[PDB]
């Protein structure tokens, strides 16, 4: 109800610098930044830099005043290219006869964007920490080698726009895919 | 830096939308709630509908209770060179003449422009220019004086020295 600041107190040093200060709860000020607006006539400008110092928090600032009269005082409050997180890919698993992995991605209307794919297959009796981590520069299918003819194995994939002019975080992993023999 | 702008980190698919998520502390929510603001241009801003969430995978904070959300905003254009509770307040009409707190007097060695050492200040001895009957000899007495404005001239006195 009353998270507002109180005790808006100001004083003039008697030279060319007014200085004001106010208290505010430490909980509300943690969510919202505030600044001291001043009007030398009834322009509006703000002071900087403001100081700060248990349940309450006192903020103070020194405003230069070269002169004036009645003052109006008040307290008031991302690049796309480098922040990209593509959606996870749709992953399937096929075997001709040899096993060949296949996945699809949301169509980027700027087709020329190179897609960096990181994949990994796992032996069910092992950790992803120590798993084959193969990389690929743009594709939508990868051929796997031969393996143990009776063991169960998992598979996972993630995409990144690891370009040059671009940047961002990887995509969330796909729903893990499994197979055996 | 406040926690919402510190916890907020927007990413995108660069084709259809932007998915932002942030958080507000539970201690503040009891006081006042906050909303995410998205500006369209210099003159006109625009609000955005948001909702709660269970996790928080993009940012972090050493707080006890947090309220993570998930805001989704759509877009039909993306290029490299793109970059993006209820009324509170208080006012005061402060004339500089009546709100004047002069400086502390510096180095009785004291446009423009007293008590004993052992004795307490609870009822010390009172005191125009900057310069036995007051003290018994062989007894220390601390120097405590400041610069206050003349009543026949407004505001408050200086700091103690």
């Amino acid at each position, epitope marked *: 109800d009353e998270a507002q600041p109180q005790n808006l107190e100001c004083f003039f040093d008697g030279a060319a610098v007014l200085s004001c200060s106010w208290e505010v709860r430490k909980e509300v000020a943690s969510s919202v930044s505030f600044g001291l607006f001043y009007k030398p006539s009834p322009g509006e400008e703000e002071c900087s830099p403001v100081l700060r110092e248990s349940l309450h928090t006192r903020h103070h600032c020194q405003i230069p005043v070269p002169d004036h009269g009645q003052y109006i005082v008040s307290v008031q409050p991302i690049k796309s290219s480098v922040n990209i997180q593509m959606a996870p890919p749709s992953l399937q698993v096929t075997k001709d006869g040899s096993y060949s992995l296949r996945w699809e991605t949301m169509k980027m209307r*700027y087709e*020329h964007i190179d897609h960096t794919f990181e994949i990994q297959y796992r032996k069910d009796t092992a950790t992803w920490k120590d798993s084959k981590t193969e990389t690929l520069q743009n594709a939508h299918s990868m051929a796997l080698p031969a393996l143990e003819p009776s063991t169960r194995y998992w598979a996972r994939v993630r995409v990144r726009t690891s370009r*040059t*002019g671009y940047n961002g975080i990887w995509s969330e992993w796909s729903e893990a895919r499994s197979w055996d023999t | 830096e406040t926690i919402p702008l510190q916890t907020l980190r927007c990413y995108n698919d660069y084709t259809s939308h932007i998915t932002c998520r942030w958080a507000d502390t539970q201690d503040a929510q009891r006081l006042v709630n906050v909303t995410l603001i998205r500006r369209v*241009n210099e003159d006109l801003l625009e609000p955005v509908s948001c909702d709660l969430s269970d996790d928080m995978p993009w940012s972090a904070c050493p707080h006890p209770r947090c309220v993570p959300r998930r805001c989704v905003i759509p*877009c*039909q*254009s993306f*290029v490299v*060179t793109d970059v993006d509770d209820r009324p509170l307040g208080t006012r005061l009409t402060v004339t500089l003449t009546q709100h004047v707190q002069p400086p502390e007097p510096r180095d009785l060695t004291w446009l423009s422009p007293y008590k004993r050492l052992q004795d307490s200040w609870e009822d010390a001895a009172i005191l125009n220019t900057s310069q036995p009957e007051h003290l018994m000899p062989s007894s220390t007495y601390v120097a405590r004086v400041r610069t206050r404005l003349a009543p026949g001239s407004s505001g408050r006195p200086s700091k103690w020295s």
Partner: antibody, heavy 116, light 108 residues
Framework: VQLLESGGGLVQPGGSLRLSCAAS????????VHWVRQAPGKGLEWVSS????????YYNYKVKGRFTISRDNSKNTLYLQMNSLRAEDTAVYYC??????????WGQGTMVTVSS | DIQMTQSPSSVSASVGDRVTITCRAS??????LAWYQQKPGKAPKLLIY???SLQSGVPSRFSGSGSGTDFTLTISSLQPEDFATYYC?????????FGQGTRLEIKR
């Protein structure tokens, strides 16, 4: 697959003049288009670029307090309008698509020879 | 507000020769710029995009390169229909600007 433009001609200083462009037979859902300027027998000078919902207008030097971009995603029609005009702008105007970090779709343009 | 300047200011050279041009920017670019060709009267054509990739409908004799601000455009071999004025394309940030406009000739 080639966009075209129209409007603009000889006019005395100060007077206004509308510029009307038009896309044509692309898959356009939905890219941005800029205006650029070619001074007679001289270099190339950029001018403006709106965006989608008429959100962000961008100008340059003189153009500020003169020209005004406008969006028209409706029937695919980027238009331009300038009021005060002088022989700093006595040039021809090219319409150009802005395929991400570069242009690709270009127009023939129109001459705007300001003079009385 | 972003100073884009290309050099040399003019370059004549015979046919079947190696050629070079360079863009210099005032601030950083990372890799956001492009390369345009302009025959007179006709509209400018996109020569090379992303500062290091050729557009469709353009031969491979052209070559782009560079990052940060020291960018280039080299031609490994020249033909007589390569007579035109060449321009730089900002892209890193607004306000978007171009090079001074280089013009080449042919040692006939």
């Amino acid at each position: 697959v080639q966009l075209l433009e129209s409007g603009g001609g000889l006019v005395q200083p100060g007077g206004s003049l509308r510029l009307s462009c038009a896309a044509s037979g692309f898959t356009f859902p939905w890219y941005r288009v800029h205006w650029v300027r070619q001074a007679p027998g001289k270099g190339l000078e950029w001018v403006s670029s709106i965006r989608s919902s008429g959100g962000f207008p961008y100008y340059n030097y003189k153009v500020k307090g003169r020209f005004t971009i406008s969006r028209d995603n409706s029937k695919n029609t980027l238009y331009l309008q300038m009021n005060s005009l002088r022989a700093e702008d006595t040039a021809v105007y090219y319409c150009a698509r802005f395929y991400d970090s570069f242009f690709d779709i270009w127009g023939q343009g129109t001459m705007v020879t300001v003079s009385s | 507000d972003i100073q884009m300047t290309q050099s040399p200011s003019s370059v004549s050279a015979s046919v079947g020769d190696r050629v070079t041009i360079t863009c210099r920017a005032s601030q950083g670019i990372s890799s956001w710029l492009a390369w345009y060709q302009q025959k007179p009267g006709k509209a400018p054509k996109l020569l090379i995009y992303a500062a290091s990739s050729l557009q469709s409908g353009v031969p491979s004799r052209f070559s782009g390169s560079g990052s940060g601000t020291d960018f280039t455009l080299t031609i490994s071999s020249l033909q007589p229909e390569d007579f035109a004025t060449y321009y730089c394309q900002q892209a890193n940030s607004f306000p978007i600007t171009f090079g001074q406009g280089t013009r080449l000739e042919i040692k006939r």
